[PDB]
Amino acid sequence: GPLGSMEDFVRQCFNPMIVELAEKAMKEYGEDPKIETNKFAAICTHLEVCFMYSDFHFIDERGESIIVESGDPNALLKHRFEIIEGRDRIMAWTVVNSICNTTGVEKPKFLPDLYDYKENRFIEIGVTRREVHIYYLEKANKIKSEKTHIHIFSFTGEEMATKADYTLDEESRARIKTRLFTIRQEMASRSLWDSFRQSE
Ligand SMILES: O=C1N=C(c2ccccc2)CC=C1O
Ligand SMILES: O=C1N=C(c2ccccc2)CC=C1O
Ligand SMILES: O=C1N=C(c2ccccc2)CC=C1O
Ligand SMILES: [Mn+2]
Ligand SMILES: [Mn+2]
Ligand SMILES: [Mn+2]
């Protein structure tokens, strides 16, 4: 079929909030979304996975973690996850320092992606077009925080997480994997996938 543009794909398949946050992030690190378009799609994808990872997860009135998929969560509920990725560096570290001073959890060297109030730990989210073990080792070598939990997703449904601790229920992670599958399929229908996979 005809080759589409990755730009068109990203604008059409991702929520504008996500697209906007991704553009601001790329701009901040001096990369242009209109040139680094595969990177642009990868950044939107990673952001979306971070949001989906926290979606619907709350801490209840008793302090137990629960899932609430209705539009209206009970007002006494607390979000289970703090989202760190997608915030400018100043606000991101402000949130990190807050969490650290509040919970007692040690401060990370690099900005992680999430904080889990149930498991009491920061999380680094990875999304890869390559083999998950390879990508896992690269991120572990980068951060080496060793308190920061790592959770890798691939576009073909594989996962790898620190100590074989996957944090979320199968259903939550299946939502994420299904989304990645749809992204891959749609890219392929626009003949964007081969270039996107190999560009990582
Ligand atoms: O949102 C981010 N984007 C990054 C980026 C952007 C363009 C090229 C390489 C890394 C790095 C770290 C982030 O938190
Ligand atoms: O995720 C980031 N978002 C940034 C951002 C977000 C909104 C407005 C300006 C910069 C800056 C750096 C990041 O790593
Ligand atoms: O895991 C991350 N990967 C990023 C990324 C992904 C693809 C291309 C450029 C940056 C940005 C921020 C992260 O936490
Ligand atoms: Mn960022
Ligand atoms: Mn991040
Ligand atoms: Mn990440």
Short mmCIF file of C-alpha atoms in Angstrom, two decimals, residues 104-189:
data_model
loop_
_atom_site.label_atom_id
_atom_site.label_comp_id
_atom_site.label_asym_id
_atom_site.label_seq_id
_atom_site.Cartn_x
_atom_site.Cartn_y
_atom_site.Cartn_z
CA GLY A 104 11.06 8.00 53.09
CA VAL A 105 11.93 6.23 49.82
CA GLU A 106 15.46 7.03 48.67
CA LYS A 107 15.92 9.65 45.92
CA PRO A 108 16.71 8.35 42.41
CA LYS A 109 19.63 9.62 40.26
CA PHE A 110 17.54 9.93 37.08
CA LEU A 111 13.91 10.85 36.67
CA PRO A 112 11.89 7.61 36.78
CA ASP A 113 8.46 7.31 35.16
CA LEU A 114 6.07 6.42 37.99
CA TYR A 115 5.86 6.07 41.74
CA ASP A 116 3.85 3.17 43.19
CA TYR A 117 2.26 4.05 46.54
CA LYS A 118 1.31 0.40 47.15
CA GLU A 119 4.70 -1.18 46.49
CA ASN A 120 6.45 1.96 47.79
CA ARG A 121 8.88 2.26 44.86
CA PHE A 122 9.68 4.21 41.70
CA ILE A 123 9.13 2.51 38.34
CA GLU A 124 11.00 2.84 35.07
CA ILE A 125 8.78 1.97 32.11
CA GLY A 126 10.37 0.65 28.94
CA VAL A 127 8.77 0.04 25.55
CA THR A 128 10.81 -1.76 22.92
CA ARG A 129 10.66 -2.98 19.30
CA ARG A 130 13.59 -5.27 20.11
CA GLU A 131 13.94 -8.25 22.45
CA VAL A 132 12.85 -7.37 25.99
CA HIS A 133 15.84 -8.91 27.75
CA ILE A 134 18.26 -6.79 25.71
CA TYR A 135 16.30 -3.62 26.38
CA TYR A 136 15.92 -4.53 30.05
CA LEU A 137 19.67 -4.89 30.53
CA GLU A 138 20.34 -1.56 28.82
CA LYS A 139 18.03 0.30 31.18
CA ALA A 140 19.31 -1.50 34.26
CA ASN A 141 22.86 -0.51 33.25
CA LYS A 142 21.83 3.08 32.71
CA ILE A 143 20.05 3.79 36.00
CA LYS A 144 21.55 1.18 38.42
CA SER A 145 19.41 2.74 41.17
CA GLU A 146 18.56 -0.80 42.35
CA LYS A 147 15.58 0.50 44.26
CA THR A 148 13.90 1.63 41.04
CA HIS A 149 11.71 -1.12 39.61
CA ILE A 150 11.98 -1.75 35.85
CA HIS A 151 9.09 -2.94 33.68
CA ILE A 152 9.65 -3.52 29.96
CA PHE A 153 6.96 -4.07 27.33
CA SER A 154 7.52 -5.13 23.73
CA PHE A 155 5.21 -4.57 20.78
CA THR A 156 4.77 -8.35 20.45
CA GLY A 157 3.46 -8.97 23.97
CA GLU A 158 6.64 -9.98 25.81
CA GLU A 159 7.39 -8.37 29.17
CA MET A 160 10.33 -8.30 31.51
CA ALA A 161 10.29 -6.87 35.02
CA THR A 162 12.70 -6.68 37.95
CA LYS A 163 12.76 -9.88 40.04
CA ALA A 164 9.88 -11.31 37.98
CA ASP A 165 7.60 -8.91 39.86
CA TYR A 166 5.11 -7.55 37.35
CA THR A 167 3.26 -5.22 39.76
CA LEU A 168 -0.12 -5.19 37.97
CA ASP A 169 -2.79 -7.84 37.27
CA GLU A 170 -2.84 -9.69 33.94
CA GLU A 171 -5.84 -7.69 32.72
CA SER A 172 -4.15 -4.30 33.18
CA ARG A 173 -1.06 -5.44 31.37
CA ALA A 174 -3.18 -7.04 28.63
CA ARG A 175 -4.79 -3.62 27.96
CA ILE A 176 -1.32 -2.21 27.43
CA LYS A 177 -0.19 -5.08 25.23
CA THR A 178 -3.39 -4.81 23.17
CA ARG A 179 -2.76 -1.10 22.64
CA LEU A 180 0.81 -1.81 21.48
CA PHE A 181 -0.50 -4.46 19.14
CA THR A 182 -2.97 -1.98 17.61
CA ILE A 183 -0.25 0.66 17.19
CA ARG A 184 1.99 -1.87 15.41
CA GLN A 185 -0.84 -3.06 13.16
CA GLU A 186 -1.86 0.48 12.21
CA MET A 187 1.74 1.47 11.47
CA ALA A 188 2.03 -1.64 9.30
CA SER A 189 -1.12 -0.77 7.37
#
